[PDB]
Design an enzyme around this catalytic site. Structure first.
Site, PDB file in Angstrom:
ATOM      1  N   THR A   1      50.385  51.742  30.056  1.00  0.00           N
ATOM      2  CA  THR A   1      50.167  50.295  29.963  1.00  0.00           C
ATOM      3  C   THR A   1      50.561  49.760  28.589  1.00  0.00           C
ATOM      4  O   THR A   1      49.926  50.068  27.588  1.00  0.00           O
ATOM      5  CB  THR A   1      48.724  49.956  30.311  1.00  0.00           C
TER       6      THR A   1
ATOM      7  N   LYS B   1      42.990  54.313  40.019  1.00  0.00           N
ATOM      8  CA  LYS B   1      41.607  54.185  39.576  1.00  0.00           C
ATOM      9  C   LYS B   1      41.109  55.559  39.153  1.00  0.00           C
ATOM     10  O   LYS B   1      41.367  56.569  39.811  1.00  0.00           O
ATOM     11  CB  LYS B   1      40.704  53.628  40.668  1.00  0.00           C
TER      12      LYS B   1
ATOM     13  N   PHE C   1      35.619  43.093  44.706  1.00  0.00           N
ATOM     14  CA  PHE C   1      35.418  42.833  43.297  1.00  0.00           C
ATOM     15  C   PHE C   1      34.678  41.541  43.013  1.00  0.00           C
ATOM     16  O   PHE C   1      35.023  40.817  42.075  1.00  0.00           O
ATOM     17  CB  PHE C   1      36.753  42.846  42.541  1.00  0.00           C
TER      18      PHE C   1
ATOM     19  N   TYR D   1      31.129  41.834  43.083  1.00  0.00           N
ATOM     20  CA  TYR D   1      29.763  42.355  42.871  1.00  0.00           C
ATOM     21  C   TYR D   1      29.226  42.097  41.479  1.00  0.00           C
ATOM     22  O   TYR D   1      29.592  42.772  40.514  1.00  0.00           O
ATOM     23  CB  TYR D   1      29.680  43.862  43.163  1.00  0.00           C
ATOM     24  N   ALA D   2      28.349  41.103  41.377  1.00  0.00           N
ATOM     25  CA  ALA D   2      27.706  40.813  40.107  1.00  0.00           C
ATOM     26  C   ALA D   2      26.828  41.997  39.746  1.00  0.00           C
ATOM     27  O   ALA D   2      26.399  42.773  40.628  1.00  0.00           O
ATOM     28  CB  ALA D   2      26.867  39.541  40.217  1.00  0.00           C
ATOM     29  N   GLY D   3      26.528  42.119  38.456  1.00  0.00           N
ATOM     30  CA  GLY D   3      25.687  43.208  37.984  1.00  0.00           C
ATOM     31  C   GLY D   3      25.618  43.209  36.465  1.00  0.00           C
ATOM     32  O   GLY D   3      25.645  42.151  35.847  1.00  0.00           O
TER      33      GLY D   3
ATOM     34  N   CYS E   1      39.830  50.872  30.671  1.00  0.00           N
ATOM     35  CA  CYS E   1      40.951  49.976  31.019  1.00  0.00           C
ATOM     36  C   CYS E   1      40.711  48.476  30.902  1.00  0.00           C
ATOM     37  O   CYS E   1      41.418  47.792  30.155  1.00  0.00           O
ATOM     38  CB  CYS E   1      41.440  50.296  32.429  1.00  0.00           C
TER      39      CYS E   1
ATOM     40  N   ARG F   1      33.399  55.411  28.474  1.00  0.00           N
ATOM     41  CA  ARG F   1      33.979  54.372  27.616  1.00  0.00           C
ATOM     42  C   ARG F   1      33.527  52.979  28.037  1.00  0.00           C
ATOM     43  O   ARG F   1      33.589  52.629  29.219  1.00  0.00           O
ATOM     44  CB  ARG F   1      35.515  54.446  27.572  1.00  0.00           C
TER      45      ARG F   1
HETATM   46  O1  LIG Z   1      44.291  50.259  34.340  1.00  0.00           O
HETATM   47  C1  LIG Z   1      43.835  51.199  35.044  1.00  0.00           C
HETATM   48  O2  LIG Z   1      44.222  52.378  34.886  1.00  0.00           O
HETATM   49  C2  LIG Z   1      42.877  50.939  36.179  1.00  0.00           C
HETATM   50  O3  LIG Z   1      41.775  50.110  35.777  1.00  0.00           O
HETATM   51  C3  LIG Z   1      40.865  49.804  36.806  1.00  0.00           C
HETATM   52  O4  LIG Z   1      40.268  51.004  37.281  1.00  0.00           O
HETATM   53  P1  LIG Z   1      38.933  51.631  36.568  1.00  0.00           P
HETATM   54  O5  LIG Z   1      38.872  51.264  35.126  1.00  0.00           O
HETATM   55  O6  LIG Z   1      38.879  53.084  36.907  1.00  0.00           O
HETATM   56  O7  LIG Z   1      37.656  51.064  37.319  1.00  0.00           O
HETATM   57  P2  LIG Z   1      37.246  49.928  38.353  1.00  0.00           P
HETATM   58  O8  LIG Z   1      36.825  50.546  39.654  1.00  0.00           O
HETATM   59  O9  LIG Z   1      38.202  48.787  38.384  1.00  0.00           O
HETATM   60  O10 LIG Z   1      35.874  49.459  37.658  1.00  0.00           O
HETATM   61  C4  LIG Z   1      35.921  48.704  36.434  1.00  0.00           C
HETATM   62  C5  LIG Z   1      34.518  48.158  36.136  1.00  0.00           C
HETATM   63  O11 LIG Z   1      34.156  46.991  36.918  1.00  0.00           O
HETATM   64  C6  LIG Z   1      32.836  47.078  37.430  1.00  0.00           C
HETATM   65  N1  LIG Z   1      32.808  46.280  38.653  1.00  0.00           N
HETATM   66  C7  LIG Z   1      33.736  46.493  39.598  1.00  0.00           C
HETATM   67  C8  LIG Z   1      33.770  45.739  40.771  1.00  0.00           C
HETATM   68  C9  LIG Z   1      32.791  44.751  40.914  1.00  0.00           C
HETATM   69  O12 LIG Z   1      32.730  44.032  41.938  1.00  0.00           O
HETATM   70  N2  LIG Z   1      31.871  44.563  39.934  1.00  0.00           N
HETATM   71  C10 LIG Z   1      31.887  45.311  38.808  1.00  0.00           C
HETATM   72  O13 LIG Z   1      31.035  45.086  37.920  1.00  0.00           O
HETATM   73  C11 LIG Z   1      32.701  48.581  37.635  1.00  0.00           C
HETATM   74  O14 LIG Z   1      31.334  48.967  37.654  1.00  0.00           O
HETATM   75  C12 LIG Z   1      33.422  49.165  36.432  1.00  0.00           C
HETATM   76  O15 LIG Z   1      32.529  49.162  35.300  1.00  0.00           O
HETATM   77  C13 LIG Z   1      41.602  49.136  37.990  1.00  0.00           C
HETATM   78  O16 LIG Z   1      40.704  49.059  39.076  1.00  0.00           O
HETATM   79  C14 LIG Z   1      42.788  49.971  38.444  1.00  0.00           C
HETATM   80  O17 LIG Z   1      43.532  49.243  39.441  1.00  0.00           O
HETATM   81  C15 LIG Z   1      43.688  50.219  37.237  1.00  0.00           C
HETATM   82  O18 LIG Z   1      44.840  51.009  37.584  1.00  0.00           O
END
Ligand SMILES: O=C(O)[C@H]1O[C@H](OP(=O)(O)OP(=O)(O)OC[C@H]2O[C@@H](n3ccc(=O)[nH]c3=O)[C@H](O)[C@@H]2O)[C@H](O)[C@@H](O)[C@@H]1O
Ligand SMILES: O=C(O)[C@H]1O[C@H](OP(=O)(O)OP(=O)(O)OC[C@H]2O[C@@H](n3ccc(=O)[nH]c3=O)[C@H](O)[C@@H]2O)[C@H](O)[C@@H](O)[C@@H]1O
Lengths: 450, 461
Positions: B123, B159, B261, B263-265, B272, B340
């Site tokens: 990236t 992911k 995506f 989901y509040a929390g 990333c 991280r």
């Molecule tokens: O740049 C990257 O390599 C990747 O970064 C993210 O992937 P990742 O960091 O593994 O994790 P996510 O599943 O996107 O979660 C990110 C954060 O958002 C939070 N989240 C996610 C979804 C949601 O509805 N609410 C929420 O708070 C999760 O708990 C987590 O802390 C992207 O989802 C990938 O598409 C991308 O390729």
């Protein structure tokens, strides 16, 4: 399974709601205080710009399922379910509607807030109904927001993505919920389209949805402006992110901003409600800020190209309505663009397939403090005529007629072949090959553009 | 059909990319500077938590299609296509750090002897491919070289913890190429390379280089925006007694918005979103533009990571001395050991700073959480003495005043409240991920404090 329904307020939302509900077999009374609107509807005319609506209204009038009247008492006596569908530009109308139901009602009523109203309005409606009842029956007030798009309203209503119903879970609440279930059953014979929740969440849902739609737009508009600074193509980026199914492809079209009588009003109302509860909506404030500046981007590009003094220049404007397929001028980006160019001395020749009359009216009001500027604004009969002697053509609203124009015809008409495009209609390379200096929003210009 | 490829940088992105491409028939050389990582891979170990990866690696080593090495010159000689997959961590000012990317580029330029496709898979900010080209061209000019090449942008959308599946069944493949002669030569090579993935459905989106570079930032920024958007609404929902999960269903059911995506929390973290959102903000500011929405998105995420401690302080007081909190979930999200930017770290620091004891559980991330939280609180040894890690979810609740859910691991979705009721002092739960129905919690006598939803009756009372 047929029900007696009253729609209070026969504007766009109320009229399509009432006519389409009559069309599935309900007996519908459409009430409105506007006697001319009611006369017009009773005369067989339709006060609004909606495909398919005239025919739905006609056949349901003929079948005895749809009536239009200004008779408030008769409206209350008719409907076991009373839909409040008045404007929310301000709640006196909603509340006045509630008081009338309370003032005249005789048996149990379900009162349905269909107009877009702030969280907590159903409670204020309940209180207004209750105190009328005090002066003198049971009822419950339900939230059932509308998700229609202007100019596509009949299709949006008859094939909804979902129907949201907010209801209390007390005794009158559950009785109301059962009646709404019966009312909407014909839309639920396949996939369940109804989503039931509590009243406040349903109220909030309507603002949240329009807020997210606006956020998507202003998000892409900021990225488009950045794209113009570092040599990227926002349409490529739109497809590149839209293809992530968590994001999706829709409402990601950057351009000269959003208008209409919904997003600006609803995002501002939500920002206001939040601040009144002691919370600053940081993202939505940014969204609203971005949009206000985005409506100045076309003029910014024109000034960069031609200078601050546009005296002696003529600009053709293609598109006036806030979006295609409507005559609605509310919060239209065209109004800001026209004011800016006129203030700088330019002549403007404007074209819109349907909105010219309404555009002339509202722009004259916009510019009431500078009536002489209007002397330099003209409206033409066809799109090519706007380009006569034009220094540039400016595309503001993506009516289909603008998508594949006759560029040879235009080339015999304009002074210089330059196009500013607030809706990104054309491929820049194609414009290059046609000798057109092309200035889209967030995409590289044609070769002539630089 | 088979092509000789080199992956420069054998971190999770490079390893998954290299192994999966070897698995479709390519002959892949995976280069890294870290000799230990390479020794480990050559001994059949895997440095990351990626389901299925060890198996694909083993199969392709056995097939003679996948090699691991620190030999830079061998790497350059092998690959007609050179993927740069090194890390792009934050620089001091928050911009993307391109030092490893440029070093890789220079190595290719310094050794290459024929046409190369140089693929920026890391990236990297818009404009990076041009800097890579300038660096390669400089090394070639020094050498009096005639060699041609083209730099392509091919971002990764994997992911963490699901990388093999995401790579093998992508939603799309983004390829940014120049339209000059070397650029079209490169595009055709990229088409050949990914052909197996486009056999039945066209999955590849071709565009110019800068738009491909931008796409990756835009996608992560939009995902972050959806999350912070819902978190702001969640905080507002609390103020007018609405239910953010009902709102999520209500707006997600408009296909223009979509369900995902929302989901509040207690906020987003990981390796990333926070770095990419900040890097894009910096890139924009360096071009004279303030990204107002993304700045807001970042600001709300920062405050959201404090919401759980705020609720706990409201419930127990500013001084948490003599209080004990069980933490369920440490990793930034389920199914990874990655710590991280994890919301747990902020929560745990705030609670320890106020005198609390902490007993923390995570199915997978305990070892890593131990390491990074000790770093976070290096200035405060006395705080670390009040932190323990347990090996069992129920054991965390031993003598706890409350249980706090930070990461929605599946195991937490079906608690044994009998086991818990035997252990905790009081049945109080603060839920940063809204796992349970408040009415159900009321029925089990649990004082339940969710984000953006009314709590159980005990919570109200
Ligand atoms: O740049 C990257 O390599 C990747 O970064 C993210 O992937 P990742 O960091 O593994 O994790 P996510 O599943 O996107 O979660 C990110 C954060 O958002 C939070 N989240 C996610 C979804 C949601 O509805 N609410 C929420 O708070 C999760 O708990 C987590 O802390 C992207 O989802 C990938 O598409 C991308 O390729
Ligand atoms: O609250 C309402 O009554 C309606 O408001 C909007 O409907 P509407 O304002 O008629 O029209 P949109 O198609 O949403 O267009 C709104 C503005 O956004 C602009 N826009 C739209 C999409 C896009 O990608 N980019 C963009 O600039 C359009 O040009 C227009 O100015 C919503 O789309 C409806 O779901 C909602 O029911």
């Amino acid at each position: 399974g047929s029900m007696n329904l009253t729609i209070i307020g026969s504007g766009s939302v109320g009229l399509v709601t009432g006519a389409c509900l009559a069309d599935i077999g309900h007996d519908v009374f459409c009430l409105d205080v506007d006697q001319a609107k009611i006369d017009i509807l009773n005369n067989g005319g339709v006060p609004i710009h909606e495909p398919g609506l005239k025919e739905v209204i006609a056949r349901n009038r003929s079948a005895g399922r749809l009536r239009f009247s200004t008779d408030i008492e008769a409206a209350v006596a008719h409907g076991d379910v009373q839909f409040i569908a008045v404007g929310t530009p301000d709640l006196q109308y909603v509340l006045a509607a509630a008081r009338n139901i309370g003032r005249y009602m005789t048996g149990f009523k379900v009162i349905v807030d269909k107009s877009t109203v702030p969280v907590g309005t159903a409670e204020r409606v309940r209180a207004a109904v209750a105190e009328e009842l005090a002066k003198r029956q049971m009822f419950s007030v339900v939230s059932n927001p509308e998700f229609l798009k202007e100019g596509a309203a009949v299709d949006d209503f008859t094939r909804p993505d979902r129907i949201v119903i907010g209801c209390d879970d007390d005794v009158p609440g559950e009785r109301a919920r059962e009646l709404m279930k019966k009312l909407y059953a014909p839309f639920n014979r396949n996939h369940e389209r109804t989503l039931y929740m509590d009243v406040r969440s349903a109220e909030f849902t309507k603002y949240a949805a329009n807020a997210m739609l606006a956020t998507r737009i202003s998000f892409m508009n900021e990225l488009a402006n950045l794209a113009d600074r570092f040599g990227a193509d926002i349409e490529a980026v739109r497809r590149g992110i839209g293809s992530d199914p968590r994001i999706g492809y829709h409402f990601l079209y950057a351009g000269c901003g959003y208008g209409g009588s919904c997003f600006p009003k609803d995002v501002e109302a939500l920002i206001r409600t939040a601040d009144e509860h002691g919370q600053s909506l940081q993202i939505l404030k940014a969204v609203s800020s971005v949009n206000a500046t985005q409506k100045r981007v076309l003029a910014d590009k024109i000034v960069a190209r031609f200078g601050e003094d546009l005296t002696g220049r003529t600009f053709a404007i293609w598109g006036l309505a806030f979006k295609p397929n409507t005559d609605d001028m509310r919060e239209a980006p065209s109004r800001e663009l026209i004011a800016e160019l006129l203030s700088r001395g330019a002549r403007i020749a404007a074209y819109d397939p349907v909105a010219q009359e309404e555009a002339r009216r509202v722009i004259a009001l916009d510019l009431a403090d500078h009536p002489s500027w209007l002397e330099r604004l003209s409206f033409v009969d066809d799109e090519a005529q706007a380009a006569r002697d034009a220094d540039a053509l400016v595309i503001v609203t993506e009516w289909k007629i603008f998508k594949s124009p006759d560029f040879v015809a235009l080339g015999r008409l304009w002074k210089t072949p330059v196009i500013f495009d607030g809706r990104n209609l054309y491929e820049p390379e194609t414009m290059s090959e046609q000798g057109i200096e092309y200035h889209p929003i967030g995409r590289p210009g044609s070769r002539q553009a630089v």
